[PDB]
Amino acid sequence: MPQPKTFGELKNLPLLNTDKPVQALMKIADELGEIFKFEAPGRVTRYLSSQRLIKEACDESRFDKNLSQALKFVRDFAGDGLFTSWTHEKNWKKAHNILLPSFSQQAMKGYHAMMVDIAVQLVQKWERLNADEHIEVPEDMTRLTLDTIGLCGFNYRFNSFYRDQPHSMVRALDEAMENKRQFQEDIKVMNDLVDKIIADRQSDDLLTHMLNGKDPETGEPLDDENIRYQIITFLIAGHETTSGLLSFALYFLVKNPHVLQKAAEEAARVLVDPVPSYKQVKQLKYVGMVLNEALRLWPTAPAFSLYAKEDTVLGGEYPLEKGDELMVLIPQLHRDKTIWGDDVEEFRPERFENPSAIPQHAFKPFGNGQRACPGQQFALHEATLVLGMMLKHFDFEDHTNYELDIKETLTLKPEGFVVKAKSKKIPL
Amino acid sequence: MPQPKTFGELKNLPLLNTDKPVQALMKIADELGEIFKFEAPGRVTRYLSSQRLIKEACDESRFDKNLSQALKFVRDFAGDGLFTSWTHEKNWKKAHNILLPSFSQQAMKGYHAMMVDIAVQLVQKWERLNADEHIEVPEDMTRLTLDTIGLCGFNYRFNSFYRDQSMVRALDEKRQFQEDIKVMNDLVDKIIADREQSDDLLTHMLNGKDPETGEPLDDENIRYQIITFLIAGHETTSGLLSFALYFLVKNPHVLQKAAEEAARVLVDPVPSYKQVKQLKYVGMVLNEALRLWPTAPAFSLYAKEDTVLGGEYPLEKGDELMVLIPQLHRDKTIWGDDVEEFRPERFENPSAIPQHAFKPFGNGQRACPGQQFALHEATLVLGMMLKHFDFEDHTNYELDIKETLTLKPEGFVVKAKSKKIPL
Amino acid sequence: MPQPKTFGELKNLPLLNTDKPVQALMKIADELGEIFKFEAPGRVTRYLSSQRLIKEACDESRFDKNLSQALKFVRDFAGDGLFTSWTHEKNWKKAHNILLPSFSQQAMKGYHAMMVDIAVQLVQKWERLNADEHIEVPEDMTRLTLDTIGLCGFNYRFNSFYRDQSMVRALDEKRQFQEDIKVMNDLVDKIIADREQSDDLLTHMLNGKDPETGEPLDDENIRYQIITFLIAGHETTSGLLSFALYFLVKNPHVLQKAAEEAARVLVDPVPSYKQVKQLKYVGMVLNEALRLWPTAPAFSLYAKEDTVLGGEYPLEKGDELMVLIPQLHRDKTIWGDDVEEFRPERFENPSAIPQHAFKPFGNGQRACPGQQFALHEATLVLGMMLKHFDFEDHTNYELDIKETLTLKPEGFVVKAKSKKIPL
Amino acid sequence: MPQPKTFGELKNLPLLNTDKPVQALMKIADELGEIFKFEAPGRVTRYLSSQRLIKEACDESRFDKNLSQALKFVRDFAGDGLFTSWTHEKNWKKAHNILLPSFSQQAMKGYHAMMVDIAVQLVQKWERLNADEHIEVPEDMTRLTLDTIGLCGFNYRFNSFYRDQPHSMVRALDEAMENKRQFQEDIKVMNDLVDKIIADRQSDDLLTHMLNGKDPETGEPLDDENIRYQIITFLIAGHETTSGLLSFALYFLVKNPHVLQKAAEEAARVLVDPVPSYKQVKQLKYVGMVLNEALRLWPTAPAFSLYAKEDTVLGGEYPLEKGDELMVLIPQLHRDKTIWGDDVEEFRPERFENPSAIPQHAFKPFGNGQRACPGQQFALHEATLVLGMMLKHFDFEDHTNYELDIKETLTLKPEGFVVKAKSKKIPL
Ligand code: HEM
Ligand code: HEM
Ligand code: HEM
Ligand code: HEM
């Protein structure tokens, strides 16, 4: 089995002593192919890149979600919330069942108004810029997605558009990625706030399903503690990933003017009213295609981890023992030439025009099976709404001829991406 | 709404009583513009010609595929195959899901060797001609496309190049009709039953389960699909290669540029898969031929709900539209004034073309699943043709377009002078 | 002439070496009465506190505006703008004539829509606060007044409500000083040049000719004026709204009467121009806040010729006076004994107030040209604030007045409970 | 173009068959707005009320002074004096140039002593009234302004304070506004007197500049005939208007006690000496403001007339032909809500505290351009002196709660206005 360069008894570990580890891993996958071994002192895992192998790995009878080293550390503040629990922990399935209805079409129609509230603040911010001011794209996308999950999820206003300096969580994430005292202080700040939000609470949100909801299976509700973990979890899982998507999407649009014009024409033809309706967002088919293609190239939660439930042979060549770990490297999956063609690096939303044409397990920016993203429709609805509005209301210019530079935390975002927006002066 | 001349109680119907109805309709569209009412007794439709209205018609939340009068009559032998089924029929979505990945640009790798088998038969036929002899172009292209689907579709050899000449008899229209259906069914069902693995669509159909329902196609629907492959993707592809060759002979600087690409790219005795992907200019030539004469030149839609077309024309749920593709492809606000000229360079960058402006393969989920297959076949064959011969428009052919459910240049003949490059 | 305590060769100067000089001076005025000599090395002035002497000081044939020590130092960045120019400078009278009609109560009709834009931003900020959260009052009023002049003054958006936080750095005082001046000039001169018509003061400046000289302002003086608008009429107006809100929370029957007017008058989702003109009681509240804490609390004068003040105090040509406005506004022979009470009803009829008794906007031709602007803005915003929220003095705030060249209640915080009335 | 009610072939003419025609016209302007057409048999004119249109009308390149019907008739006794001549008549410009110096600061300082002479007689008259006697305000103001122009202008004492019955001119004016024989007799009386005053004449007056003055332009003096017309003209133009102003001003003061007290305090603080000095009068800023505000509401020469010099379009909507007439209705101009605010009817001298705030052409109680009042500084100086003295020496009481009733001749005055004066016993 292929294996990248080693560092004495550190084995491969220093390979990840970089700002950009997922990107380093993508480059190792390009030289070594569909599978390689990665050793650190005291652990091994295998990185998977081809649809052929990833599809077997997605077989829930053979493999289950693993918590990677990263996630194990995140668990210090995310506890047994959905993202950082084991499938077999009682609280995974309980919360999974309680939370599914929170992502129901009925509920999505409920959130639409609050999504529009934050989307409007974003569009007003940009209308109000002076001539030759520019926009800090990920910084503004982050303000939006944080406010949106704050408001839709627990009726709480972060008021990000009213601030330069933010509301701890990002400092907790970086440490996981004196240090002890800070970390503890950060966990505490997150906890009191959230626990205070919980204690204090009649609203159209995720916190409500959690307060008034019983798991049909066990008949038990979530206790207040798992509730806070769930709240912490929405903010870590369902905000920066969405932010990155919108930033990558705008980037690809400004780099591909013909794609921009198709999406813009769609937004003008479809978004006929001063504010978008739920139904109008569902009509933005091409914008949806742009977002999927952005996700294909730069899936913003770019890896997930698995363990073998039993001894098993992968692909008919690589035997695994019970407990062995696998990592799915999503961006390499999404660049599998045998699936997508040889032009995998080009940005072509029309790959998704006829979606049944995409083979099973070839496109996985939202994970797999019962452990896949529950926030998928929410995130796509938000992103489609916001992008539609952006393209309806402004022309965009890549005034610096920005060079793609991708910052890695748990998630991916293009750092320093800036554009200028020229208002079409269409009333909001 | 504009409307062409009427015939008392027959309304507009006698206008379609002609050998060339799509061409009649293009001419009407020239006179009346982007939209006209067409009325017949019992029924009404609206013909659309501008990108401006057609782009709304292509909105899948507002419009869905309709089976035209012609398609309703093809359904007697094509059944609930993909071409002649309604989107809401359970078998549409099942066959769609099962069949669609096996038509990827990537799936062509498995069909490539078989396409080459027939393409080599075509080239040899032409090398073996004596000096005064000429090529009957659509007759030989139909030989090729038919054998190519037979072979790629179900590992069956029509052996059209060993022959001069019942399915075609059926497309015409009421008792011989029953017997025509009979031969196709006996033939196709025997094959299905006879069938062990091949590199064909039938293999994939038998081994195929729909992700949604978890069901396979039943043997009968599978029969309908094979019939449909031939009805849908042999004559259209044949027409395309024939139109393409016509335009090339009529535009010798264009022919010379395509022949140069062919010679520069097709360096091996037979073309590889990657080499075909590299015939950029030949691809542009084919797209331009499709712009001017899309070989399935119309498709029908119905309004899913009450809606308004272009801010002007109210339609009610169930109201019909016909997209007149050759007129759309002549829309001057999209293409510029020179719409009648053959200029492959319009496709220098295919992504420069506006959404819903170029639609020779129809629309959305009801678009042609065989698009990449047809283009891979046409590019390979046309590449080989340009590599191996020079062509002469020896009669100075006068374009005459015959209409069935598809379009082809009837009587188009050429001479080929072999360049003597071996296979 | 009475005179406060001296410090050897430093005379009275060390008395001003304090965070709160105007407040120090009020306290001195309490001890010494209507007039005192204030001496520093090299210079002398006389501080006036009674309406009886101030009314003679306001006689324009006998006294003219003087640039104080503080204003002489502001002139390094404010230049020959209106605030920091001598009356006899050609540019004073030119700018005065050009600018003054564009500040009519009537000219506010054109600024009204822009004032509402910022006022709506203020209200939304507050509606969007979570339940335990509080408002930093002078910080938010400064956000509002600054953005309002930016927008009404030069169609420029400071976007202060999208921010937490170099001009203010300059008012403080000698090398960073040069760079502070630099940013303001680059910024303002670019705008002037960039500039097509807007509803702003800059438009009027560019199109404006002085009736007397027939001249326009030059681009540089125009730069000085824009700078001056912000130095003169953002902090004073900010201080006013903040003091007004302080007094309202400290006097809940007064707040309730103002809130009742607001609710009765502001019947539409946003206020119209006429409706603001109709907030009589809110206007009275603002005037009473200005009586107690006039936010530009002093102005300086010099004797145009030898003259005698109040039959007692000979002054020579060029001798200086300072009008201590908060003391004048506490003159018991004009106002009665209750001068420390907040009573808007003193302004039931503003014309009942004796000439030169109430002077928060200075005097004669050198008075504040932005008076109606400031009051229109303050009345509109305070009307909206009272319409949309109840206010709670949640810390039982202890008035602490910070002094720059203007006065504001530092650290003043409140909670707002939304009344849930839509915009 | 709006037009008030008609009377058959009399058109609008009977509208002016009233004692109070300017006031009738003001009420028509309130219903019809900034411009209306007024037809009489054989003539048309357009009445103007808004600052917007009046400012164009004041453009001397487009419009020149017209003699209205009234002025044409007055011309029967005022001849080609300044007030009733055409701009292009040789004698207008000649006399205009000769007379300008007669209104020079140097000359105004000259007149001050004679103004004080008559002002003193006015104040003595009132000191000498018995308890509970009252004052006939316009009758006394008229006695003052006639004596003042008599004495300052041509060293002639009308001695109005020594009489009940007056010194013909008013009978000549009324007729213009057996009849023939009287009119002729009146013209004659005015003429002999004046011509006698001229023949008979070493003095500090207007008659002197006229006798010893040459027009710098033509080098010609005024002949004795135009001199008499000029003398007649000072008495018709610069006496009743000034009288009306002082009467309106006192009226507004007694109706607005807070304004009275401000003006009175100013008069006591400023007029420190037994008789006012020239410089002290110039210091009466608030009294000046009171007079301007009186003039704003009730301009005592309330209309002037113009003709279009060439075809021209007024305001971009009303085309005019050469010779077309306009009337400026000054009191309506002065009530233009778009200029002054909605409280235009209130008496607020502080409108004038910061005079540069008044827009161009919004305030025109002294006419326009080269045809504006030359007696403006004289009239304001006189009125300011007299009002200051009145407010210095007496308290005033509106003992009858007088109801405003405005008599119209060429000019406006409040008829029957009476007050009681209580002496402050301050030595004169
Ligand atoms: C485009 C934006 C998003 C992307 C690309 C994304 C991607 C993913 C992926 C790949 C996983 C699987 C992780 C693993 O296997 O270890 C996941 C899980 C999860 N995500 Fe999302 N996500 C997005 C938005 C959201 C949003 C908006 C929410 C909340 C509303 C959310 C909440 C969650 C939760 C709770 C889990 C854990 C699910 C479970 O195991 O029960 N995500 N996400
Ligand atoms: C140049 C060649 C071709 C052209 C111009 C063409 C054109 C089209 C058009 C316009 C439609 C939409 C019809 C409608 O909306 O009613 C369609 C559908 C279809 N075509 Fe093609 N076609 C071509 C080649 C092929 C080939 C090679 C195959 C199969 C091997 C094929 C199979 C089909 C099928 C099954 C449908 C129905 C799809 C569905 O509705 O699910 N076609 N074609
Ligand atoms: C409540 C708010 C305000 C207060 C209390 C205030 C107070 C004053 C005072 C006391 C002066 C006279 C200074 C002196 O004699 O040295 C003055 C002058 C001035 N103010 Fe205001 N002001 C206010 C608002 C404004 C606004 C909104 C503007 C402009 C938009 C403005 C522009 C000016 C200017 C340019 C001068 C100098 C005028 C000259 O001398 O020609 N002020 N102000
Ligand atoms: C407040 C009192 C006065 C008012 C309101 C007043 C008003 C006016 C007005 C409006 C005109 C222009 C008439 C027109 O355009 O047809 C005028 C002209 C004239 N006035 Fe005055 N006036 C006053 C006092 C005086 C006095 C005191 C004198 C003499 C000393 C005087 C002498 C004249 C003369 C000679 C003209 C004609 C000027 C010319 O066209 O050359 N007026 N007056």
mmCIF file with all atom_site columns, all heavy atoms in Angstrom, chain D residues 298-311:
data_model
loop_
_atom_site.group_PDB
_atom_site.id
_atom_site.type_symbol
_atom_site.label_atom_id
_atom_site.label_alt_id
_atom_site.label_comp_id
_atom_site.label_asym_id
_atom_site.label_entity_id
_atom_site.label_seq_id
_atom_site.pdbx_PDB_ins_code
_atom_site.Cartn_x
_atom_site.Cartn_y
_atom_site.Cartn_z
_atom_site.occupancy
_atom_site.B_iso_or_equiv
_atom_site.pdbx_formal_charge
_atom_site.auth_seq_id
_atom_site.auth_comp_id
_atom_site.auth_asym_id
_atom_site.auth_atom_id
_atom_site.pdbx_PDB_model_num
ATOM 1   N N   . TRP D 1 298 ? -47.680 93.309  5.779   1.00 0.00 ? 298 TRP D N   1
ATOM 2   C CA  . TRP D 1 298 ? -48.472 94.399  5.185   1.00 0.00 ? 298 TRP D CA  1
ATOM 3   C C   . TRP D 1 298 ? -47.657 95.479  4.418   1.00 0.00 ? 298 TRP D C   1
ATOM 4   O O   . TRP D 1 298 ? -47.601 96.652  4.842   1.00 0.00 ? 298 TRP D O   1
ATOM 5   C CB  . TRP D 1 298 ? -49.426 95.001  6.248   1.00 0.00 ? 298 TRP D CB  1
ATOM 6   C CG  . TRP D 1 298 ? -50.498 94.002  6.574   1.00 0.00 ? 298 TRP D CG  1
ATOM 7   C CD1 . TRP D 1 298 ? -50.716 93.368  7.780   1.00 0.00 ? 298 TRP D CD1 1
ATOM 8   C CD2 . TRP D 1 298 ? -51.463 93.454  5.650   1.00 0.00 ? 298 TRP D CD2 1
ATOM 9   N NE1 . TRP D 1 298 ? -51.773 92.490  7.667   1.00 0.00 ? 298 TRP D NE1 1
ATOM 10  C CE2 . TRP D 1 298 ? -52.240 92.504  6.373   1.00 0.00 ? 298 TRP D CE2 1
ATOM 11  C CE3 . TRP D 1 298 ? -51.739 93.671  4.288   1.00 0.00 ? 298 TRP D CE3 1
ATOM 12  C CZ2 . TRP D 1 298 ? -53.292 91.765  5.771   1.00 0.00 ? 298 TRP D CZ2 1
ATOM 13  C CZ3 . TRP D 1 298 ? -52.791 92.956  3.678   1.00 0.00 ? 298 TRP D CZ3 1
ATOM 14  C CH2 . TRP D 1 298 ? -53.560 92.014  4.428   1.00 0.00 ? 298 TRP D CH2 1
ATOM 15  N N   . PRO D 1 299 ? -46.986 95.078  3.304   1.00 0.00 ? 299 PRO D N   1
ATOM 16  C CA  . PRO D 1 299 ? -46.153 96.006  2.525   1.00 0.00 ? 299 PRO D CA  1
ATOM 17  C C   . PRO D 1 299 ? -47.060 97.137  2.077   1.00 0.00 ? 299 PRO D C   1
ATOM 18  O O   . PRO D 1 299 ? -48.107 96.877  1.451   1.00 0.00 ? 299 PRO D O   1
ATOM 19  C CB  . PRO D 1 299 ? -45.682 95.153  1.325   1.00 0.00 ? 299 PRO D CB  1
ATOM 20  C CG  . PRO D 1 299 ? -46.712 94.034  1.236   1.00 0.00 ? 299 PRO D CG  1
ATOM 21  C CD  . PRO D 1 299 ? -47.063 93.752  2.671   1.00 0.00 ? 299 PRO D CD  1
ATOM 22  N N   . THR D 1 300 ? -46.719 98.375  2.417   1.00 0.00 ? 300 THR D N   1
ATOM 23  C CA  . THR D 1 300 ? -47.730 99.423  2.376   1.00 0.00 ? 300 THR D CA  1
ATOM 24  C C   . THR D 1 300 ? -47.899 100.035 0.978   1.00 0.00 ? 300 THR D C   1
ATOM 25  O O   . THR D 1 300 ? -48.866 100.772 0.751   1.00 0.00 ? 300 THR D O   1
ATOM 26  C CB  . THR D 1 300 ? -47.427 100.531 3.406   1.00 0.00 ? 300 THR D CB  1
ATOM 27  O OG1 . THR D 1 300 ? -46.062 100.950 3.257   1.00 0.00 ? 300 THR D OG1 1
ATOM 28  C CG2 . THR D 1 300 ? -47.646 99.978  4.841   1.00 0.00 ? 300 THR D CG2 1
ATOM 29  N N   . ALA D 1 301 ? -46.945 99.768  0.083   1.00 0.00 ? 301 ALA D N   1
ATOM 30  C CA  . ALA D 1 301 ? -47.149 99.911  -1.371  1.00 0.00 ? 301 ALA D CA  1
ATOM 31  C C   . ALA D 1 301 ? -47.177 98.481  -1.912  1.00 0.00 ? 301 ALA D C   1
ATOM 32  O O   . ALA D 1 301 ? -46.120 97.930  -2.300  1.00 0.00 ? 301 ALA D O   1
ATOM 33  C CB  . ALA D 1 301 ? -46.008 100.707 -2.003  1.00 0.00 ? 301 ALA D CB  1
ATOM 34  N N   . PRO D 1 302 ? -48.364 97.860  -1.887  1.00 0.00 ? 302 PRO D N   1
ATOM 35  C CA  . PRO D 1 302 ? -48.453 96.404  -1.960  1.00 0.00 ? 302 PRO D CA  1
ATOM 36  C C   . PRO D 1 302 ? -48.361 95.779  -3.359  1.00 0.00 ? 302 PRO D C   1
ATOM 37  O O   . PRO D 1 302 ? -48.222 94.579  -3.432  1.00 0.00 ? 302 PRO D O   1
ATOM 38  C CB  . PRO D 1 302 ? -49.828 96.126  -1.355  1.00 0.00 ? 302 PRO D CB  1
ATOM 39  C CG  . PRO D 1 302 ? -50.636 97.248  -1.892  1.00 0.00 ? 302 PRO D CG  1
ATOM 40  C CD  . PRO D 1 302 ? -49.701 98.449  -1.649  1.00 0.00 ? 302 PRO D CD  1
ATOM 41  N N   . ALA D 1 303 ? -48.413 96.565  -4.429  1.00 0.00 ? 303 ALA D N   1
ATOM 42  C CA  . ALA D 1 303 ? -48.248 96.025  -5.792  1.00 0.00 ? 303 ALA D CA  1
ATOM 43  C C   . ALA D 1 303 ? -47.292 96.887  -6.633  1.00 0.00 ? 303 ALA D C   1
ATOM 44  O O   . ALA D 1 303 ? -47.186 98.120  -6.439  1.00 0.00 ? 303 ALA D O   1
ATOM 45  C CB  . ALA D 1 303 ? -49.600 95.882  -6.495  1.00 0.00 ? 303 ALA D CB  1
ATOM 46  N N   . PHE D 1 304 ? -46.554 96.234  -7.528  1.00 0.00 ? 304 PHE D N   1
ATOM 47  C CA  . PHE D 1 304 ? -45.918 96.947  -8.644  1.00 0.00 ? 304 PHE D CA  1
ATOM 48  C C   . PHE D 1 304 ? -46.085 96.155  -9.927  1.00 0.00 ? 304 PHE D C   1
ATOM 49  O O   . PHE D 1 304 ? -46.337 94.950  -9.926  1.00 0.00 ? 304 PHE D O   1
ATOM 50  C CB  . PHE D 1 304 ? -44.455 97.323  -8.375  1.00 0.00 ? 304 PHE D CB  1
ATOM 51  C CG  . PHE D 1 304 ? -43.561 96.164  -8.076  1.00 0.00 ? 304 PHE D CG  1
ATOM 52  C CD1 . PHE D 1 304 ? -42.816 95.573  -9.092  1.00 0.00 ? 304 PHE D CD1 1
ATOM 53  C CD2 . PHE D 1 304 ? -43.435 95.670  -6.771  1.00 0.00 ? 304 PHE D CD2 1
ATOM 54  C CE1 . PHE D 1 304 ? -41.977 94.523  -8.809  1.00 0.00 ? 304 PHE D CE1 1
ATOM 55  C CE2 . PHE D 1 304 ? -42.579 94.618  -6.490  1.00 0.00 ? 304 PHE D CE2 1
ATOM 56  C CZ  . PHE D 1 304 ? -41.861 94.035  -7.519  1.00 0.00 ? 304 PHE D CZ  1
ATOM 57  N N   . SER D 1 305 ? -45.941 96.857  -11.028 1.00 0.00 ? 305 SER D N   1
ATOM 58  C CA  . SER D 1 305 ? -46.356 96.341  -12.304 1.00 0.00 ? 305 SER D CA  1
ATOM 59  C C   . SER D 1 305 ? -45.130 96.229  -13.214 1.00 0.00 ? 305 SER D C   1
ATOM 60  O O   . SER D 1 305 ? -44.197 97.049  -13.103 1.00 0.00 ? 305 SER D O   1
ATOM 61  C CB  . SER D 1 305 ? -47.391 97.328  -12.871 1.00 0.00 ? 305 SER D CB  1
ATOM 62  O OG  . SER D 1 305 ? -47.890 96.911  -14.120 1.00 0.00 ? 305 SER D OG  1
ATOM 63  N N   . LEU D 1 306 ? -45.148 95.263  -14.132 1.00 0.00 ? 306 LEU D N   1
ATOM 64  C CA  . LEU D 1 306 ? -44.076 95.098  -15.140 1.00 0.00 ? 306 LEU D CA  1
ATOM 65  C C   . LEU D 1 306 ? -44.613 94.770  -16.507 1.00 0.00 ? 306 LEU D C   1
ATOM 66  O O   . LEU D 1 306 ? -45.754 94.287  -16.613 1.00 0.00 ? 306 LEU D O   1
ATOM 67  C CB  . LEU D 1 306 ? -43.128 93.978  -14.729 1.00 0.00 ? 306 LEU D CB  1
ATOM 68  C CG  . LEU D 1 306 ? -42.562 94.052  -13.308 1.00 0.00 ? 306 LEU D CG  1
ATOM 69  C CD1 . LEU D 1 306 ? -42.298 92.662  -12.845 1.00 0.00 ? 306 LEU D CD1 1
ATOM 70  C CD2 . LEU D 1 306 ? -41.315 94.945  -13.241 1.00 0.00 ? 306 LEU D CD2 1
ATOM 71  N N   . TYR D 1 307 ? -43.804 95.030  -17.547 1.00 0.00 ? 307 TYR D N   1
ATOM 72  C CA  . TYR D 1 307 ? -44.078 94.573  -18.897 1.00 0.00 ? 307 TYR D CA  1
ATOM 73  C C   . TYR D 1 307 ? -42.908 93.756  -19.434 1.00 0.00 ? 307 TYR D C   1
ATOM 74  O O   . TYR D 1 307 ? -41.739 94.004  -19.073 1.00 0.00 ? 307 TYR D O   1
ATOM 75  C CB  . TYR D 1 307 ? -44.386 95.743  -19.848 1.00 0.00 ? 307 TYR D CB  1
ATOM 76  C CG  . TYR D 1 307 ? -43.203 96.612  -20.223 1.00 0.00 ? 307 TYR D CG  1
ATOM 77  C CD1 . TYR D 1 307 ? -42.482 96.409  -21.418 1.00 0.00 ? 307 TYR D CD1 1
ATOM 78  C CD2 . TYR D 1 307 ? -42.805 97.641  -19.388 1.00 0.00 ? 307 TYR D CD2 1
ATOM 79  C CE1 . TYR D 1 307 ? -41.376 97.226  -21.759 1.00 0.00 ? 307 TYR D CE1 1
ATOM 80  C CE2 . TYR D 1 307 ? -41.722 98.420  -19.685 1.00 0.00 ? 307 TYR D CE2 1
ATOM 81  C CZ  . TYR D 1 307 ? -41.011 98.231  -20.866 1.00 0.00 ? 307 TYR D CZ  1
ATOM 82  O OH  . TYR D 1 307 ? -39.952 99.085  -21.091 1.00 0.00 ? 307 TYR D OH  1
ATOM 83  N N   . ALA D 1 308 ? -43.215 92.780  -20.294 1.00 0.00 ? 308 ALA D N   1
ATOM 84  C CA  . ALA D 1 308 ? -42.189 91.968  -20.944 1.00 0.00 ? 308 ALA D CA  1
ATOM 85  C C   . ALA D 1 308 ? -41.570 92.797  -22.058 1.00 0.00 ? 308 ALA D C   1
ATOM 86  O O   . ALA D 1 308 ? -42.280 93.343  -22.905 1.00 0.00 ? 308 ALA D O   1
ATOM 87  C CB  . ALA D 1 308 ? -42.786 90.631  -21.507 1.00 0.00 ? 308 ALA D CB  1
ATOM 88  N N   . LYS D 1 309 ? -40.244 92.898  -22.037 1.00 0.00 ? 309 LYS D N   1
ATOM 89  C CA  . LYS D 1 309 ? -39.512 93.687  -23.014 1.00 0.00 ? 309 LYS D CA  1
ATOM 90  C C   . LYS D 1 309 ? -39.528 92.940  -24.348 1.00 0.00 ? 309 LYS D C   1
ATOM 91  O O   . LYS D 1 309 ? -39.553 93.566  -25.399 1.00 0.00 ? 309 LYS D O   1
ATOM 92  C CB  . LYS D 1 309 ? -38.074 93.940  -22.538 1.00 0.00 ? 309 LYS D CB  1
ATOM 93  C CG  . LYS D 1 309 ? -37.955 94.893  -21.332 1.00 0.00 ? 309 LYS D CG  1
ATOM 94  C CD  . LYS D 1 309 ? -36.660 94.651  -20.516 1.00 0.00 ? 309 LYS D CD  1
ATOM 95  C CE  . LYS D 1 309 ? -35.398 94.961  -21.333 1.00 0.00 ? 309 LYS D CE  1
ATOM 96  N NZ  . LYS D 1 309 ? -35.426 96.380  -21.822 1.00 0.00 ? 309 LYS D NZ  1
ATOM 97  N N   . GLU D 1 310 ? -39.482 91.605  -24.287 1.00 0.00 ? 310 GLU D N   1
ATOM 98  C CA  . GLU D 1 310 ? -39.512 90.735  -25.488 1.00 0.00 ? 310 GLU D CA  1
ATOM 99  C C   . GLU D 1 310 ? -40.404 89.537  -25.202 1.00 0.00 ? 310 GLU D C   1
ATOM 100 O O   . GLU D 1 310 ? -40.703 89.292  -24.026 1.00 0.00 ? 310 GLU D O   1
ATOM 101 C CB  . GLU D 1 310 ? -38.106 90.220  -25.810 1.00 0.00 ? 310 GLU D CB  1
ATOM 102 C CG  . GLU D 1 310 ? -37.127 91.278  -26.274 1.00 0.00 ? 310 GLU D CG  1
ATOM 103 C CD  . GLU D 1 310 ? -37.643 92.087  -27.466 1.00 0.00 ? 310 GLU D CD  1
ATOM 104 O OE1 . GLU D 1 310 ? -38.490 91.589  -28.273 1.00 0.00 ? 310 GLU D OE1 1
ATOM 105 O OE2 . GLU D 1 310 ? -37.202 93.229  -27.592 1.00 0.00 ? 310 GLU D OE2 1
ATOM 106 N N   . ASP D 1 311 ? -40.818 88.808  -26.254 1.00 0.00 ? 311 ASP D N   1
ATOM 107 C CA  . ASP D 1 311 ? -41.462 87.499  -26.102 1.00 0.00 ? 311 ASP D CA  1
ATOM 108 C C   . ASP D 1 311 ? -40.604 86.690  -25.174 1.00 0.00 ? 311 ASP D C   1
ATOM 109 O O   . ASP D 1 311 ? -39.384 86.715  -25.297 1.00 0.00 ? 311 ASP D O   1
ATOM 110 C CB  . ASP D 1 311 ? -41.524 86.701  -27.423 1.00 0.00 ? 311 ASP D CB  1
ATOM 111 C CG  . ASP D 1 311 ? -42.461 87.302  -28.471 1.00 0.00 ? 311 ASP D CG  1
ATOM 112 O OD1 . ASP D 1 311 ? -43.201 88.274  -28.183 1.00 0.00 ? 311 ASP D OD1 1
ATOM 113 O OD2 . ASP D 1 311 ? -42.442 86.766  -29.607 1.00 0.00 ? 311 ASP D OD2 1
#
